[PDB]
Amino acid sequence: YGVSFFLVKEKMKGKNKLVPRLLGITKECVMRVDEKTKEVIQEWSLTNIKRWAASPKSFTLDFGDYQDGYYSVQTTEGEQIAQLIAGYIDIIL
């Protein structure tokens, strides 16, 4: 078991709704992947996580609360993203 991938929705510019997207949890980071290309648009250390929050419709990460550390998206499988993340911070800690 290695890097994990989750199709999540994100709030982009140009409209007001969310845009399907693709997340990638790495035992060293978290990233916003372009479901379109599968390439990474964003990255964020997993060992940098402060506290996250998976939901039945969405999931969220809290890293940077100093200012704005809250990065979230829409996904009907958070506990899957979160348990792993949670399980990954368990490693890299």
Binding site: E10, K11, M12, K13, N16, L18, R51, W52, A53, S55, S58, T60, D62, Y70, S72, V73
Partner: peptide, 24 residues
């Protein structure tokens, strides 16, 4: 330390549906 986190992040998530997003 768990307690409200869920609601503490969900309340924040509301800001992702409001209208802004990331304010770049």
């Amino acid at each position: 330390d768990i307690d409200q986190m869920f609601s503490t992040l969900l309340g924040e998530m509301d800001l992702l549906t409001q209208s802004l997003g990331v304010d770049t």
